């Protein structure tokens, strides 16, 4: 290490990695958002704008690989032991670690995802599910699913509980199967097989706001909704293209917003990590689509230095709000409108960091002896070809320094539609900047 | 609707309702505290439905199936008649000091000849993807004392360039071996062509027709064997002020004169005479003509369309299959008449494929509109007022009909992609 | 009104249900005594007329339909509820035909932009708007008038807008699914439009199935091609028929080949398709032989094109003749 400078924080970041967020409702007036830097986690307010409420300390020594936030605590799994890195799970509360989770010693797997309910927490690694009693924070059992094939035994997609099922977990195989296990006895009770078995893997799964119906997203493409005790399929949808699989899905519990009248419920948002677009379906009659949101972030590309995607969707508690965190260090919260009908939501909140590394870095001189001062504003010229004024004081009061109605320019053109792209429209990247507030009168 | 799988752990399990504060309000009587797991999950179902009532989707057709299909939503052609996927591309970096005389595209490769009345020719390769100079300059050739009026690519393969201006002589440059010929005698017509101004080369690259400086009641011009550079024929029509414009047919055997007052004359070589005369309808005086198309009257050269631009400024477009009556309608009817520019049209040109018709006047700022065949209407979404054309002087389609080149009278040629 | 305050409580449905009478003084008086802040957001276009009492015209209502989708949405919902409750009536459906036709006409008349993905995406959004009503009216089986009106709107949708072949065939497929016999000949006109503006040369299956189900095919087809240019439809038909290995389509194939409706190019490529079908087949071949000798002994330019197509494929008519006759 060093002798002068101690590490304090990595900024320019709201959600750049692949890990999705986690979202809890506080009371009937706020929603907590929780996102991983990659070496920490922050929790934002929803009603109070998108300022930062909690910053997670101390830093995990390794890259975080899973998280979820309960009523008070932040549960974060870090560490892919497949390459050197020590792993663990920690329990924070209000940005500070209160506890640590006892790992099994025989875990040579990175730990994929986290779920909490009842008095139990369940954690899915790669093909392996470990359980702790949450009331004691103690290791209870370890679930080991089995398949005939080295491929098919892989636990891709994920797992969920139904709201009305006592102690039952629903996991997706690398095969198209969903397995129900009772966690109390740790026993695989049931499994369900994919209809039209050309579809390969459960890429995702989500309970619906109705009772005992699971939606399953297949890497082979179909979105299905099924009764989960009757094993009764409610609907098929051909929405996933073959090499363009869907990422995830959510339903609107706000109670209205379908059927083109405003007078109907049951809307699905879905998204694919191949795109930057998302999709909206009215589920009532034919499960029709109604609306494409085109390029809600930058879509991922390997030909370009641009980094992005869509790591999640969520409908929050019963309101027009939907969060999408991408991989383009990107959150934009969207809003359903009431007085007209609209296909799409419009944006209502945003936070952004770059989609590429930072080229140049500079500070602002003092409001000559005042408060805007030495250490408030830092200008960053990012290889995403942009200029950002970052606030060391309160990270929300940082902003972009726009170049105009550029997004609307793209929307009038087709940069958001399907030529160049949006970084190619914004000015080229940044060699070197200099500032002087000796006239900068605000 | 029978439940497929069953558990025994729920019958084994029981829960204390009155002890549970959250679950306290879910009882039916003030006696139910210890409740089995199956009844407990049933009360959970009641609580959940009381929280949220059941939805109607929780209670095929071809386009409904297409509708639920999302592969239905994913992000040169032949081109539809009212708009164009048009895209202005990079500009030629080298300018001209004088007004632009002409443009010419090479028939095989994307090679462009720009030509200025500053006695100067430029050759460029079309390369938007070039560095650090897109659309690179091949050559800058200057010809002394000789302001270029017009030049032509000779060869369907495009091997030579002839160029001719206000001087009484013209030149042929063979690119292979790079040789120059200064032709200065048309075998007894040296009082008869005091210029070499207007000329047209056959599409087969065989015949060169030069107009005459003797108007006096009727235009005349000479046909030349190109490879031999010799007088082979002459055509002469009776009008008022001589030759307005003229063009071969798609074969290169017969041709068309338009002279002022709008008189158009078809003339075949195998008969070595004028096929006939007709009138561009109501045009008081023509200034430009052009001829293009396929699948027309093969006896009249198989080309489909004739373009007539008159000194008023109206654009008369006709179908030669409708020109037939080998007999000729003396008063043909307009397939399409065009009143979308005020002053006299400066230059008009056909696309190679037979779809597009570019036309413009030069007295106004940027008089240029574009026509789709065979609907014969304008493209109402290009060009804008702030489309930087200039007082247009030269218009060339590319060989493959993907590229538009235009040039004003200032020395600034610009380029467009015609995407269909 | 004077008991149930309907003008205040059910402004939208009352306003829509008197909306198709936009030149009568009863409608004028309704406009007189509505409350302004109660008029629906879709319906707030009459505000100049409620300032100045005068019956608004169709141009005004439809211009709002163009650059206001939701008016069309609401009137579509009313009239489809009318036909779903079987209480449709000719004034209603004629009004609704004029409304949708000029409406979507204006919608494309802006939606053509010139920018490539923009026109594709705009057509997407348009399709999402018009989806439910056009499907319900394409297969509204009890109401032939709204079937005709759906024919109208999707026909203009085809002929004007440069739509993609899959969407076009999907329109074809629902129309196939939904027609009747009183609607038969007009639906044939629609398929002439649809296949005529199609770009690919073949039809997708069930369309050909129902066109076999069509009773008076070549007679109706000559009647419509008297003014309508049905050639791409006939070509897609015969492609689908030689693709089908069923042998009950052969009288239809023979009649359409003699019909003098397809081009010489279409006729020769269909004849080569039929002989390659005879080459791939493994009686059946006896029916193929009787059909092929009928076509080769056809009299006019159809038979002449068949014989010259035999000449250009260079296979022996005598070989197959004696092979099927022996």
């Amino acid at each position: 290490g060093s002798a002068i400078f101690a590490p304090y924080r990595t900024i320019g970041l709201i959600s750049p990695t692949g890990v999705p967020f986690t979202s809890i409702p506080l009371g009937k007036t706020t929603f907590q958002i929780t996102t991983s830097v990659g070496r920490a986690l922050q929790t934002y307010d929803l009603k109070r704008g998108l300022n930062l409420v909690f910053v997670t300390r101390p830093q995990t020594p390794s890259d975080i690989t899973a998280t979820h936030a309960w009523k008070e605590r932040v549960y974060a799994a870090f560490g892919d032991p497949r390459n050197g890195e020590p792993q663990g799970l920690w329990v924070f509360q209000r940005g500070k670690k209160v506890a640590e989770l006892p790992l099994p010693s025989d875990l040579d797997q990175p730990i994929k995802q986290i779920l909490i309910f009842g008095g139990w927490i369940v954690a899915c690694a790669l093909t392996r599910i470990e359980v702790w009693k949450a009331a004691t924070l103690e290791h209870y059992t370890t679930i080991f699913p089995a398949a005939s094939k080295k491929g098919d035994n892989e636990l891709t997609g994920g797992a969920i509980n139904m709201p009305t099922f006592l102690n039952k977990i629903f996991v997706g195989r690398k095969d198209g199967w969903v397995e129900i296990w009772n966690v109390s006895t740790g026993k695989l009770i049931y499994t369900l097989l994919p209809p039209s078995p050309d579809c390969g893997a459960v890429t995702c799964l989500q309970p619906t706001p109705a009772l005992s119906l699971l939606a399953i997203a297949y890497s082979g493409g179909p979105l299905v909704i099924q009764n989960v005790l009757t094993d009764k399929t409610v609907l098929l949808l051909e929405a996933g293209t073959d090499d363009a699989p869907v990422t995830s899905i959510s339903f609107r519990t706000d109670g209205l917003g379908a059927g083109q009248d405003g007078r109907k419920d049951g809307v699905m948002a879905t998204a694919t990590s191949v795109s930057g677009d998302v999709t909206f379906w009215d589920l009532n009659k034919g499960g029709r689509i109604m609306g494409v949101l085109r390029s809600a972030h930058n879509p991922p590309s390997r030909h370009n230095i641009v980094r992005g995607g869509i790591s999640k969707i969520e409908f929050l508690a019963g309101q027009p709000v939907i969060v999408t965190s991408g991989l383009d260090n990107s959150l934009k919260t969207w809003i359903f409108d009431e007085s007209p009908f609209s296909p799409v939501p419009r944006i209502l909140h945003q936070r952004s960091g770059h989609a590429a590394p930072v080229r140049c870095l500079h500070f602002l001189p003092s409001d000559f002896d005042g408060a805007e001062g030495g250490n408030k504003w830092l200008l960053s010229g990012g290889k995403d070809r942009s200029l950002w004024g970052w606030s060391l004081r309160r990270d929300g009061q940082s902003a972009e320094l726009s170049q105009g109605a550029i997004r609307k320019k793209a929307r009038k053109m087709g940069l958001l539609a399907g030529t160049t792209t949006l970084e190619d429209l914004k000015a080229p990247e940044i060699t070197c900047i200099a500032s002087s507030l000796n006239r900068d009168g605000g | 609707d029978a439940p497929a799988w069953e558990d025994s752990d729920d019958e084994r399990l029981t829960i204390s309702l009155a002890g549970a504060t959250r679950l306290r309000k879910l009882r039916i009587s003030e006696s139910e505290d210890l409740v089995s797991g199956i009844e407990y999950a049933r009360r959970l179902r009641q609580q959940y439905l009381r929280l949220y009532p059941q939805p109607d989707w929780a209670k095929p057709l071809p386009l409904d199936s297409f509708l639920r299909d999302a592969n239905s939503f994913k992000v040169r052609r032949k081109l539809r008649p009212e708009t164009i996927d048009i895209q202005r591309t990079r500009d030629i970096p080298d300018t001209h000091k004088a007004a632009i005389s002409s443009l010419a595209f090479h028939p095989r490769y994307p090679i462009l000849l720009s030509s200025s009345t500053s006695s100067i020719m430029y050759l460029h390769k079309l390369d938007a993807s070039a560095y650090p100079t897109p659309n690179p300059l091949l050559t800058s050739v200057h010809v002394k004392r000789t302001d270029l009026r017009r030049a032509a690519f000779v060869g369907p393969d495009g091997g030579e360039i002839i160029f001719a201006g206000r001087r009484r002589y013209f030149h042929c440059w063979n690119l292979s071996s790079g040789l120059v010929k200064k032709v200065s005698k048309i075998q007894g017509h040296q009082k008869e062509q005091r210029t070499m101004e207007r000329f047209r080369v056959s599409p087969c690259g065989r015949y060169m027709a030069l107009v005459a400086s003797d108007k006096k009641g009727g235009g005349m011009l000479n046909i030349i064997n190109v490879g031999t550079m010799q007088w082979i024929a002459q055509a002469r029509i009776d009008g008022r002020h001589g030759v307005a414009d003229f063009a071969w047919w798609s074969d290169g055997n017969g041709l068309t004169i338009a002279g002022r007052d709008g008189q158009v004359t078809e003339w075949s070589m195998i008969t070595r005479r004028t096929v006939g005369i007709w009138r561009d309808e109501g045009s008081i005086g023509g200034t430009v003509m052009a001829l293009g198309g396929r699948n027309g009257p093969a006896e009249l050269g198989g080309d489909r369309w004739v373009a007539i631009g008159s000194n008023s400024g109206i654009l008369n477009v006709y179908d030669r299959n409708d020109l037939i009556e080998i007999r000729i309608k003396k008063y043909p009817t307009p397939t399409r008449v065009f009143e979308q520019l005020t002053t006299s049209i400066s230059v008009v040109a056909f696309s190679p494929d037979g779809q597009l018709l570019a036309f413009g006047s030069q007295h106004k700022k940027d008089a240029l509109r574009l026509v789709h065949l065979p609907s014969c209407t304008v493209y109402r979404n290009w060009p804008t007022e702030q489309t930087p054309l200039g007082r247009v002087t030269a218009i060339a389609f590319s060989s493959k009909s993907d590229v538009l080149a235009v040039g004003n009278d200032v020395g600034r040629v610009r380029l467009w992609e015609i995407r269909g | 009104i004077r008991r149930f305050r309907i003008h205040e409580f059910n402004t939208g449905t009352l306003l829509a249900t008197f909306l198709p009478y936009h030149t009568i003084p009863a409608f004028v008086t309704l406009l007189s005594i509505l409350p302004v802040q109660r008029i629906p957001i879709e319906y707030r276009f009459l505000d100049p007329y409620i300032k100045s009492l005068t019956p608004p015209p169709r141009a005004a209502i439809v211009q709002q339909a163009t650059n206001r989708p939701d008016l069309l949405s609401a009137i579509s919902r009313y009239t489809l509820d009318s036909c779903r409750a079987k209480q449709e009536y000719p004034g209603l459906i004629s009004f609704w035909g004029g409304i949708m036709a000029e409406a979507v006409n204006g919608m494309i008349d802006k939606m053509r932009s010139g920018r490539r993905a923009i026109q594709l995406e705009n057509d997407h959004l348009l399709l999402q708007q018009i989806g439910p009503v056009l499907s319900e009216a394409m297969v509204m089986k009890d109401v032939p008038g709204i079937q005709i009106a759906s024919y109208m709107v999707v026909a203009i949708l085809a002929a004007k807008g440069s739509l993609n072949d899959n969407i076009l065939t999907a329109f074809m497929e629902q129309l196939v699914h939904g027609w009747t016999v009183d609607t038969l000949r007009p639906g044939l006109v629609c398929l002439t439009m649809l296949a005529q503006h199609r770009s690919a040369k073949q039809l997708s299956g069930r369309v050909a199935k129902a066109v076999i189900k069509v009773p008076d095919l070549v007679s109706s087809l000559r009647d419509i091609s008297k003014e309508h240019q049905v050639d791409k439809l006939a070509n897609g038909l015969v492609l689908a028929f030689v693709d089908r290995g069923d042998i009950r389509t052969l009288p239809v194939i023979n009649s359409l080949l003699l019909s003098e409706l397809l081009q010489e190019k279409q006729a020769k490529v269909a004849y080569k398709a039929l002989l390659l079908a005879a080459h791939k087949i493994d009686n059946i071949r006896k029916q193929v032989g009787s059909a092929l000798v009928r076509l080769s002994q056809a009299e006019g330019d159809v038979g002449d094109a068949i014989r010259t197509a035999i000449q250009e494929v260079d296979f022996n008519i005598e070989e197959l003749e004696l092979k099927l006759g022996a």
Binding site: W120, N161, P163, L166, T253, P340 | R22, Y52 | -
Partner: peptide
């Protein structure tokens, strides 16, 4: 002016606790 979305507000909406799934 019509067609306008109002000031966004938090709506009150009750939820189901899954913490009782033990």
């Amino acid at each position: 002016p019509v067609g306008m979305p109002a000031k966004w507000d938090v709506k009150e909406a009750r939820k189901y606790n899954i913490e009782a799934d033990g």
